[PDB]
């Protein structure tokens, strides 16, 4: 559901890009030769598309990934020890006494 | 490097599959020199201890390689370079010996760059086993600082999306069950 | 010889007619004819075929090795290699005791002849054939590690020692824990030889924690090596867990008193006094087959003093560093710092212009993809570990005893 | 130096200029380091307990 949820959002944006791309293709052949502030801005948004990142943003982006990634590692350890605890409890009844 | 590693693996396999239990002297020499190349001092020392004294007596080149290895263990770079260039190495040993020379040069260069904010020009020349002035010009073209008055050298210390998504899926699948 | 021919014919019939369990029980039967009758086994090997015929050949070979009449070892070794190469031991897992005894006898012969270099590969192949999974530890591993230690060739061992083998083989009840102790002691020695002090200490600790009701010299040597490795790595003797053991510790602690004295003097933290004690007790530590571990302990004490200085000093001169650590001069301190930096044990820098060593503050802020990759690598070990844990838990559920209590 | 060894001063001795610098380490760097050590110890203890099940399921002991 989480991935389909982002799949719908990307599809929504993907449909918008198709409309812009088709309009430019039609303008190259027919339509209005220049819709003025629209294609001017549409080009500006294709230039703003590569959001420039500096060293600090990649520093913080990797900072967030490592923090929760460690949290993910802790969650796996917590799940693993519970399975170990269940294994130990079952093993102490399988052959062991007391 | 990669070819040297493949040769080392092949020589180790040949040693393990030796018919009479004793490898040919070229194989032992290649093994020892390649262990010296990778700075694997423990493996080289154990291999030298494993070699019977009959090979050592019948092949003084093996003794020379062992002396070079002992010099590497003591990390006396001028002595290391002097000993390497003193003994004539056969066609199977000369290129790998020169590779060991280059590896030692790079190792000393990195150690000086890391540990030494300042170093005497003579000390750096001894560490690299090269004359002082051309070493100075080589480090100047390396973007370093050198003081002529005090003869001191100031070295300058220098996941794809597909792999991530696979790891993220393995996050959920492990926690899903 | 008629009885041997009848036995060969019976083995052939059981192999050709698909009688796996009948052949296994015939091999496991009395076999007095094989024991009393000899000099005809070569014809048995020649006439018999491979696969389970080769399993019968292996049984005959084990009978041969059980006798002192073993002849030309070269011809025997070629036959053993041919059997291993053409091995189809789909049922050798039943006659594990015979194979374990064969491996023990072969290793004893190799030690007697002082040729342990070639036995490493044969024992590796034997381990591969015997174990069900890579997570299985057998008695052959002890002999393999012994051969690696004697031959001073630790290269093959390290792969199969870096893997945790959590399935001990009963050897049909013939697995004496002496093999377990030998394997752990020799693996610890091999790891010490490769400067892998952490895994060597782990192996020594596991060997110490083995529940044993009697004293053995191998166990005492494992304890002594554990003390030495603990002194080298952590600078102190790691406390034995309350997971504990049996009379082992109770009798060792009185016995290994000299190593405890060495540990105490190490705790006093005086290189001069430590060297004086070592000279006093030289002959005591000479009974170790290695004296280099004491020099390694001294070097580790020097490195620990340097690290304690770094934990307290931000920048220290070479002269004062030599004075504090009691070194002969600034050059020795400079060389020690360079060697420690090369090994990655400290982050510092030396300024020869002013004769100062700058103990740099820890630059590792842990903000690189390498740490993320390392975390993901530990993940896959944990996920595989959890899957193995779940698999055993399912196997436990199959046990009738759990079901009988549940029903 | 003795106080640092005992504790409760949290300081570093820059003996070059003889200046005592206080230690203020980031929690995250220490947290990540010891968390990784815990995971390595947890895996090592996971191996040891995993090993212990071997000698008991297969009845392995000194006779």
Q: Do D57 and A95 touch (CB under 8 A)?
A: yes
Q: In terms of DSSP bridges, do strands D19-22 and C313-317 run parallel, antiparallel, or are they unpaired?
A: unpaired
- Which residues does residue B154 pair with via DSSP β-bridges, in sequence order? B145
Residues B72, B66: Cα–Cα separation, whole Å: 10
Residue D3 distance to chain A (closest CA, Å): 34
Contact list, D51 vs chain A (CB under 8 Å): none
| Residue C378: its H or E element | helix C369-398
Q: Do C176 and D62 touch (CB under 8 A)?
A: yes
Letter string b/e over residues C124-152, b meaning 16 or more CB atoms within 10 A of that residue's CB: bbbbeebbeeeebbbbbbbbbbbbbbbbb
Helix C20-27 with C2-16: angle, nearest 10 deg: 150
From the list C42, C139, C38, the residue with the least C-alpha distance to C98 is C139
Chain B partners of A76 at a C-beta cutoff of 8 Å? 174-175
Query: Could you give the angle at the alpha carbon of C7 between the alpha carbons of C1 and C8, nearest 5°?
Result: 90
Distance CA C152, CA C115 (A): 11
How far does the CA of residue C73 sit from the closest CA of chain D (Å)?
33
What distance in Å separates the CA atoms of residue B68 and residue B45, rounded to the nearest whole number? 12
Hey, is C407 helix, strand or coil?
coil
SS3 category, C211: coil
Q: How far is A57 from chain B (nearest CA, A)?
A: 17
What the block records as the tokens of B167 is: 């790891």
Length in residues, chain C: 407
Q: Are C179 and C212 in contact (CB under 8 A)?
A: no
CA dist C212 to A25, C136, C178, C249, C379, Å? 84, 22, 10, 10, 36
Q: How far is CA A14 from CA A10, A39, A42, C272, in A?
A: 6, 18, 15, 75
Strands D11-14 and C349-351: unpaired
User: How far is residue B31's CA from residue B48's CA, in Å, rounded to a whole number?
Assistant: 10
Instruction: Decide if D46 touches A, using CB distance below 8 A.
Output: yes
Touching subunits of A (3+ CB pairs, under 8 Å) are: B, C, D
Q: Answer for the pair C385, A80: CB distance below 8 angstroms, yes or no.
A: yes
Query: What residues form DSSP beta bridges with C137?
Result: C168
Among C212, C206, C201, CA closest to C248: C212
Q: What are phi and psi of C255, to 5 degrees?
A: -75, -55
E strand spans, chain B? 116-120, 145-147, 152-154
Resolution limit in angstroms? Answer: 7.5
> What is d(CA C334, CA C355) in angstroms, rounded to the nearest whole number?
10
Residues of chain A that touch chain D, judged by Cβ-Cβ distance less than 8 Å: 66-67, 70, 73-74, 77, 80-81, 84, 87-88, 91, 94-96
Q: Is residue C276 within 8 Å of C294, Cβ to Cβ?
A: no
Q: Say which of C168, C202, C314 has its CB closest to residue D54.
A: C168
Name beta bridge partners: C168: C137
Q: Round to whole Å and give the CA distance between C9 and C25.
A: 15
Structural contact between residues B105 and B128, judged by C-beta atoms closer than 8 angstroms: yes
With 0-12 / 13-18 / 19 or more C-beta atoms within 10 angstroms meaning exposed / middle / buried, residue B28 is buried
As a whole number of angstroms, the distance between CA B152 and CA B146 comes to 6
Phi, psi angle pair for C195, to nearest 5° = 60, 25
Q: How far apart are CA D28 and CA C138, in angstroms?
A: 44
Q: What is the spatial distance between Cα B114 and Cα B119, in angstroms, rounded to a whole number?
A: 11
Question: Would you state the structure tokens that stand for residue A18, as one six-digit string?
Answer: 């198709």
Give residue for tokens 């630790």. C154
Between CA D22 and CA C314 the distance in angstroms is: 10
Of C153, C372, C383, the CB nearest to B170: C383
Structure token pair of residue B102: 């280059």
């Amino acid at each position: 559901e989480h991935l389909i949820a982002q799949h719908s959002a990307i599809k929504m944006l993907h449909s918008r890009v198709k409309l812009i791309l088709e309009y430019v293709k039609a303008s190259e052949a027919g339509e209005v030769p220049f819709n003025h502030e629209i294609l001017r801005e549409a080009y500006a948004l294709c230039h703003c598309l590569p959001v420039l990142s500096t060293d600090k943003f990649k520093t913080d982006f990797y900072d967030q990934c490592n923090d929760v990634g460690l949290m993910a590692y802790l969650g796996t350890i917590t799940k693993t020890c519970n399975t170990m605890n269940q294994f130990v409890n079952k093993f102490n009844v399988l052959y062991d006494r007391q | 490097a990669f070819s040297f590693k493949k040769l080392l693996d092949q020589c180790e396999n040949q040693e393990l599959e030796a018919p009479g239990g004793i490898a040919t002297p070229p194989v032992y020499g290649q093994l020892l020199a390649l262990y010296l190349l990778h700075n694997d001092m423990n493996n080289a020392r154990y291999l030298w201890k494993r070699i019977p004294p009959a090979i050592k007596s019948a092949n003084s080149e093996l003794g020379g390689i062992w002396s070079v290895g002992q010099r590497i263990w003591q990390r006396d770079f001028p002595g290391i370079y002097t000993t390497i260039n003193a003994h004539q190495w056969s066609e199977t040993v000369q290129p790998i010996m020169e590779a060991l020379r280059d590896a030692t040069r790079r190792r000393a260069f990195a150690l000086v760059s890391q540990a030494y904010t300042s170093i005497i020009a003579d000390d750096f020349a001894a560490f690299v086993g090269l004359p002082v002035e051309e070493a100075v010009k080589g480090i100047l073209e390396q973007g370093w600082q050198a003081d002529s008055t005090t003869r001191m050298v100031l070295p300058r210390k220098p996941i794809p999306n597909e792999q991530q998504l696979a790891r993220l899926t393995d996050y959920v699948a492990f926690l899903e069950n | 010889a008629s009885a041997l021919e009848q036995f060969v014919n019976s083995v052939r019939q059981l192999s050709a007619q698909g009688q796996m369990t009948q052949l296994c029980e015939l091999i496991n039967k009395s076999g007095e004819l094989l024991a009393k009758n000899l000099s005809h086994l070569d014809t048995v090997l020649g006439a018999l075929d491979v696969q389970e015929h080769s399993l019968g050949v292996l049984a005959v070979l084990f009978v041969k090795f059980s006798m002192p009449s073993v002849p030309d070892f070269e011809t025997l070794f070629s036959q053993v290699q041919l059997f291993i190469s053409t091995c189809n031991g789909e049922h050798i897992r039943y006659a594990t005791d015979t194979f374990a005894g064969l491996c023990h006898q072969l290793t004893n012969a190799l030690v007697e002849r002082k040729q342990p270099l070639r036995g490493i590969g044969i024992l590796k192949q034997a381990i591969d054939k015997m174990q069900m999974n890579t997570n299985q530890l057998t008695s052959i591993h002890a002999d393999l590690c012994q051969l690696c230690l004697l031959a001073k060739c630790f290269k093959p061992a390290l792969p199969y020692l870096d893997v945790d083998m959590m399935d001990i083989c009963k050897e049909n009840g013939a697995y004496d824990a002496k093999h377990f102790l030998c394997y752990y002691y020799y693996g610890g020695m091999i790891y010490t030889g490769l400067k892998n002090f952490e895994r060597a200490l782990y192996f020594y600790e596991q060997a110490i924690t083995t529940p044993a009701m009697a004293v053995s010299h191998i166990m005492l040597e494992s304890y002594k090596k554990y003390i030495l490795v603990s002194l080298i790595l952590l600078g102190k003797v790691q406390q034995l867990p309350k997971y504990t053991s049996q009379i082992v510790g109770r009798f060792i602690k009185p016995l290994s008193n000299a190593y405890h004295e060495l540990a105490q003097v190490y705790s006093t933290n005086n290189p001069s006094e430590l060297r004086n004690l070592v000279n006093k007790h030289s002959e005591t530590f000479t009974r170790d087959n290695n004296m280099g571990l004491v020099k390694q302990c001294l070097s580790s004490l020097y490195k620990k003093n340097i690290q304690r200085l770094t934990k307290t000093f931000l920048t220290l001169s070479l002269q004062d560093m030599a004075s504090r650590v009691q070194l002969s001069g600034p050059q020795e301190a400079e060389k020690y710092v360079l060697h420690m930096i090369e090994d990655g044990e400290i982050f510092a820098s030396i300024n020869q212009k002013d004769g100062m060593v700058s103990f740099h503050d820890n630059p590792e802020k842990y903000n690189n993809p390498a740490m993320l990759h390392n975390i993901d690598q530990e993940m896959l070990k944990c996920i595989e570990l959890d899957e193995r844990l779940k698999a055993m838990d399912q196997e436990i559920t199959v046990n009738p005893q759990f079901v009988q209590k549940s029903m | 130096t003795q106080l640092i060894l005992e504790g409760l001063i949290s300081a570093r001795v820059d003996s070059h200029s003889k200046i005592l610098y206080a230690r203020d380490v980031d929690q995250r760097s220490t947290t990540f380091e010891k968390s990784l050590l815990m995971g390595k110890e947890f895996q090592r203890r996971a191996k040891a307990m995993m090993l212990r099940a071997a000698v008991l399921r297969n009845q392995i002991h000194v006779k």
